[PDB]
């Protein structure tokens, strides 16, 4: 039930091409997604986009 | 129809619709919840609605 | 000039391969020389790797302004 | 079982199946082994074009 | 002679932290002619090592004494006189980490060479003048023979 | 700590293996970091509210 | 069937096999939270080339 409420509240949000996140009407929620503009699915480090020491050893 | 004994077919629930929203598969969600369930052409008047 | 991202996103890749495989499933001319591949989605992916799909992506910014990008001039990746 | 909660929110679909699962490591990780008695029923409409006329005749 | 290193070692301790494994023991050695210390894993089923033993260790970049550095693939079946005939235990691994020590704050010359024989490690630590010719990703043949 | 002159002429040449970094590796390092940062951005169109809802409800 | 996160539904490339069970590789048990104890898993075959392509890519 908690997840059904969170889905019905959040599902309209989408990341536009100018990298803002706007609601269904067009009001801005965030000017950039999460401050940096980065995907959580591509985080190689602890919530950071790279881990430089591992890449340099690579 | 509903169950196995009626040769019924499965159910896209309220949660698998959410999961298909999460991928951003717009046309797959359209195809599942319209074309392979009940497709129908209406004609809507544009002036009176 | 065009300000949006030069990488083809995964949604643009999915729909360009969808519309192109649908057109090749109907009797459209195939731009690359196919080699006995039958499933039209494979023919669309072979067209995408060789950069010959005749699709222009029109990306709409939410104010109303748009940008036309050819599929052959995006930077596709895995 | 009304219109909204019963038929608009989530509706039953066809071209579907339901079977008990059992493991098989010999497949790749992006393959599923569909039985024959389900794959004879589930169909995909393949439009005839120039690339696959000789396949669909067979 | 494509020898990188050749010295006589003496075993100081056979199993430091208990017999963790059945077939492999973690030797801790030390040399005579130089001030080398040697951590080594050997296969003690095929080649038993006791506590006060004393062996001669050789690390060479090739097994052929004419200096033929051609090694596309090793052949166990072919027979020809090689360097391994003078020895009783021949492994083969890769150097993977040359690393300077951190225990001294300035003006030290002790270097460590970690050589991994398919998982069986070896720390060859000593003065930097002895270890000339070690590089990362070079493939060495260890050779070894007990002395009377 | 090791007394290595930067001209490249000290005699135990194994000492140049300690913290070895070359300009080719610096070029490949910076290109790999730029490529990972460019592929790690939130792609536009991503249904990011649904990802928030599922990543909290799971 | 109880679809918690978005990896409760993925798309595999089917292969037909004689016996009567859906057989997938066991490395994919962690997304579905399947357990092979008589668990059932639904199948959905898309009927349109756009639906195939969106399933295969996304
Ligand atoms: Mg279970």
Curated annotation (Swiss-Prot), chain B:
Entry binding sites for DNA template strand: 4-5, 11
Residues engaged in binding Zn(2+): 45, 48
Superkingdom of source: Eukaryota
Subcellular location, record wording: Nucleus; Cytoplasm, Cytosol
Subunit structure and binding partners: Component of the RNA polymerase III (Pol III) complex consisting of 17 subunits: a ten-subunit catalytic core composed of POLR3A/RPC1, POLR3B/RPC2, POLR1C/RPAC1, POLR1D/RPAC2, POLR3K/RPC10, POLR2E/RPABC1, POLR2F/RPABC2, POLR2H/RPABC3, POLR2K/RPABC4 and POLR2L/RPABC5; a mobile stalk composed of two subunits POLR3H/RPC8 and CRCP/RPC9, protruding from the core and functioning primarily in transcription initiation; and additional subunits homologous to general transcription factors of the RNA polymerase II machinery, POLR3C/RPC3-POLR3F/RPC6-POLR3G/RPC7 heterotrimer required for transcription initiation and POLR3D/RPC4-POLR3E/RPC5 heterodimer involved in both transcription initiation and termination.
The family this protein is said to belong to: Belongs to the RNA polymerase beta chain family.
UniProt protein name: DNA-directed RNA polymerase III subunit RPC2
Organism listed in the record: Homo sapiens (Human)
Protein's gene: POLR3B
Segment of the intact protein contained: 1036 to 1084 of 1133
Swiss-Prot record, chain C:
Annotated compartments: Nucleus; Nucleus, Nucleolus
Impact when changing residue 11 to N: In a breast cancer sample; somatic mutation
Gene Ontology cellular component list: cytosol; fibrillar center; nucleoplasm; nucleus; RNA polymerase I complex; RNA polymerase II, core complex; RNA polymerase III complex
Protein's UniProt keywords contain Nucleus: yes
Keywords: Acetylation, DNA-directed RNA polymerase, Nucleus, Phosphoprotein, Transcription
GO molecular function: DNA binding; DNA-directed RNA polymerase activity
Superkingdom: Eukaryota
One GO term (biological process): transcription by RNA polymerase I
Record family assignment: Belongs to the archaeal Rpo6/eukaryotic RPB6 RNA polymerase subunit family.
Self-association and partners: Component of the RNA polymerase I (Pol I), RNA polymerase II (Pol II) and RNA polymerase III (Pol III) complexes consisting of at least 13, 12 and 17 subunits, respectively. Pol I complex consists of a ten-subunit catalytic core composed of POLR1A/RPA1, POLR1B/RPA2, POLR1C/RPAC1, POLR1D/RPAC2, POLR1H/RPA12, POLR2E/RPABC1, POLR2F/RPABC2, POLR2H/RPABC3, POLR2K/RPABC4 and POLR2L/RPABC5; a mobile stalk subunit POLR1F/RPA43 protruding from the core and additional subunits homologous to general transcription factors POLR1E/RPA49 and POLR1G/RPA34.
Protein name (Swiss-Prot/TrEMBL): DNA-directed RNA polymerases I, II, and III subunit RPABC2
Gene source species: Homo sapiens
Part of the intact protein present: 50 to 127 of 127
Curated annotation (Swiss-Prot), chain E:
GO cellular component: cytosol; nucleoplasm; nucleus; protein-DNA complex; RNA polymerase I complex; RNA polymerase II, core complex; RNA polymerase III complex
Pfam families associated with the record: RNA_pol_Rpb8
Organism: Homo sapiens
Subcellular location: Nucleus; Nucleus, Nucleolus
Record's protein name: DNA-directed RNA polymerases I, II, and III subunit RPABC3
The protein's role, per its UniProt record: DNA-dependent RNA polymerase catalyzes the transcription of DNA into RNA using the four ribonucleoside triphosphates as substrates. Common component of RNA polymerases I, II and III which synthesize ribosomal RNA precursors, mRNA precursors and many functional non-coding RNAs, and small RNAs, such as 5S rRNA and tRNAs, respectively.
Xref: SMART domains: RPOL8c
Complex and partners: Component of the RNA polymerase I (Pol I), RNA polymerase II (Pol II) and RNA polymerase III (Pol III) complexes consisting of at least 13, 12 and 17 subunits, respectively. Pol I complex consists of a ten-subunit catalytic core composed of POLR1A/RPA1, POLR1B/RPA2, POLR1C/RPAC1, POLR1D/RPAC2, POLR1H/RPA12, POLR2E/RPABC1, POLR2F/RPABC2, POLR2H/RPABC3, POLR2K/RPABC4 and POLR2L/RPABC5; a mobile stalk subunit POLR1F/RPA43 protruding from the core and additional subunits homologous to general transcription factors POLR1E/RPA49 and POLR1G/RPA34.
Gene Ontology biological-process annotations: transcription by RNA polymerase II
Family: Belongs to the eukaryotic RPB8 RNA polymerase subunit family.
Gene: POLR2H
Residue(s) carrying N-acetylalanine: 1
This protein's record includes keyword Zinc: no
Record bears the keyword Metal-binding: no
Region (Non-specific ssDNA binding): 15-39
Predominant place of localization: nucleus
UniProtKB/Swiss-Prot annotation, chain G:
Record's subcellular location: Nucleus; Cytoplasm, Cytosol
Residues that, per the record, bind Mg(2+) 2: 35, 37
Binding, RNA: 39
Disease link: Leukodystrophy, hypomyelinating, 7, with or without oligodontia and/or hypogonadotropic hypogonadism: An autosomal recessive neurodegenerative disorder characterized by childhood onset of progressive motor decline manifest as spasticity, ataxia, tremor, and cerebellar signs, as well as mild cognitive regression. Other features may include hypodontia or oligodontia and hypogonadotropic hypogonadism. There is considerable inter- and intrafamilial variability. Wiedemann-Rautenstrauch syndrome: An autosomal recessive, neonatal progeroid disorder characterized by intrauterine growth retardation, failure to thrive, short stature, hypotonia, variable mental impairment, and a progeroid appearance. Clinical features include apparent macrocephaly, sparse hair, prominent scalp veins, entropion, greatly widened anterior fontanelles, malar hypoplasia, and generalized lipoatrophy. Death usually occurs in early childhood but survival to third decade has been reported.
Family per similarity comment: Belongs to the RNA polymerase beta' chain family.
Protein name: DNA-directed RNA polymerase III subunit RPC1
Organism listed in the record: Homo sapiens
Residues of the full protein shown: 465 to 522 of 1390
């Amino acid at each position: 039930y908690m997840q059904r409420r969170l889905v019905k509240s959040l599902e309209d949000l989408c990341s536009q091409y100018d990298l803002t996140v706007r609601s269904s009407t067009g009001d801005i929620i965030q000017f950039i997604y999460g401050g940096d503009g980065l995907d959580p699915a591509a985080m190689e480090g602890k919530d950071e986009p790279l881990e430089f020491k591992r890449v340099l050893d690579n | 129809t509903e169950g196995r004994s009626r040769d019924g077919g499965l159910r896209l629930g309220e949660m698998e619709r959410d999961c298909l929203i999460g991928y951003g598969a717009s046309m797959l969600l359209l195809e599942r919840l319209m074309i392979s369930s009940d497709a129908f052409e209406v004609d809507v008047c544009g002036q009176c609605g | 000039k065009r300000i949006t991202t030069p990488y083809m996103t995964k949604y643009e890749r999915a729909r360009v391969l969808g519309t192109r495989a649908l057109q090749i499933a109907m009797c459209a001319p195939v731009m690359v020389e196919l080699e006995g591949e039958t499933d039209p989605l494979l023919i669309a992916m072979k067209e995408l790797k060789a950069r010959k799909i005749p699709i222009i992506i029109r990306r709409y910014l939410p104010d109303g302004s748009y940008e036309d990008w050819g599929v052959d001039e995006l930077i596709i990746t895995d | 079982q009304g219109r909204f909660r019963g038929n608009l929110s989530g509706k039953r679909v066809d071209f579907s199946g339901r079977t008990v699962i059992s493991p098989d490591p010999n497949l790749r990780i992006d393959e599923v082994a569909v039985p024959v008695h389900v794959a004879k029923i589930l169909t995909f409409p393949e439009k005839v074009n120039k690339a696959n006329i000789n396949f669909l005749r067979k | 002679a494509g020898i990188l290193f050749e010295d006589i070692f003496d075993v100081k301790d056979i199993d430091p932290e208990g017999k963790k494994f059945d077939r492999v023991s973690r030797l801790h050695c030390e040399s005579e002619s130089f001030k080398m210390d040697l951590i080594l894993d050997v296969n003690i089923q095929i080649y038993p090592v006791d506590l006060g033993d004393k062996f001669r260790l050789v690390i060479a970049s090739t097994l052929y004494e004419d200096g033929t550095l051609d090694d596309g693939e090793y052949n166990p079946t072919d027979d020809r006189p090689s360097r391994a005939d003078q020895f009783e235990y021949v492994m083969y691994g890769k150097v993977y980490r040359i690393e300077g020590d951190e225990t001294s704050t300035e003006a030290a010359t002790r270097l460590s060479a970690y050589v991994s024989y398919g998982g069986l490690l070896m720390r060859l630590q000593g003065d930097a003048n002895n270890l000339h010719g070690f590089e990362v990703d070079s493939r060495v043949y260890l050779l070894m023979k007990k002395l009377a | 700590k090791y007394g290595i002159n930067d001209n490249g002429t000290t005699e135990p040449r194994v000492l140049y293996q300690l913290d070895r970094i070359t300009p080719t590796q610096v070029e490949k390092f910076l290109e790999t970091c730029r490529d990972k940062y460019m592929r790690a951005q939130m792609e536009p169109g991503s249904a990011v509210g649904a990802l928030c809802a599922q990543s909290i409800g799971e | 069937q109880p679809s918690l996160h978005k990896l409760s539904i993925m798309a595999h490339l089917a292969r037909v096999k004689p016996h009567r069970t859906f057989r997938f590789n066991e490395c994919v048990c962690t997304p579905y939270n399947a357990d092979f104890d008589g668990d059932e898993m639904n199948l959905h075959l898309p009927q349109t080339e756009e639906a195939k392509a969106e399933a295969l890519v996304l």
